[PDB]
C-alpha cells in the first residue's frame, strides 16, 4: 500500500606610497575587505558607491559601482593581503600569498581612480 563595517581614524589616510596590511578569516561566508574613502557610509553596501573599493570571496568578486567577477573564493582560516599604489594607482588582492587574477588575465583589480583625499582600511 545586517553587516557591520569596521574601519581606521579617516586621520590614517594616506596620499603616496604603497601599503599593504593582512585580513584573517577563520570562516568563508559573506566578506568584504577593502580600502575606503574617509566618507564611507557605515550602513550601505561596502563599496557599492563611489566611496570604497573592496572584494568579497562569497562571489569571487571586486566592489565598485557594481560588482565584477575578480579571484578566488576562499575556505575556513585564511588571510589576504592588500596592497595599493598610489604613484599608479593600483589596487592588489593576494589570497594567501597567491596574487588575484581577473577575468582578462591582469593581476590589476582597479585603476585609473581620483586620490581625492585618501583611503582608509575597511572589512564588512
Given at each position: 500500500y545586517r553587516f557591520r563595517i569596521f574601519r581606521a581614524e579617516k586621520t590614517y589616510a594616506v596620499k603616496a606610497g604603497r601599503w599593504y596590511f593582512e585580513f584573517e578569516a577563520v570562516t568563508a561566508g559573506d566578506m568584504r575587505v577593502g580600502w575606503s574613502r574617509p566618507?564611507?557610509?557605515?550602513?550601505?553596501?561596502?563599496?557599492?558607491?563611489?566611496?570604497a573599493f573592496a572584494f568579497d570571496g562569497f562571489k569571487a568578486q571586486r566592489w565598485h559601482q557594481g560588482n565584477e567577477h575578480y579571484g578566488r573564493s576562499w575556505q575556513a582560516g585564511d588571510v589576504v593581503g592588500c596592497m595599493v599604489d598610489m604613484n599608479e594607482h593600483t589596487m592588489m588582492f593576494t589570497l594567501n600569498g597567491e596574487i588575484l587574477l581577473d577575468d582578462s588575465g591582469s593581476e590589476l583589480a582597479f585603476k585609473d581612480f581620483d586620490v581625492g583625499d585618501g583611503f582608509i582600511p575597511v572589512c564588512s
Open positions: 566618507g564611507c557610509q557605515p550602513d550601505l553596501e561596502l563599496g557599492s558607491d563611489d566611496r
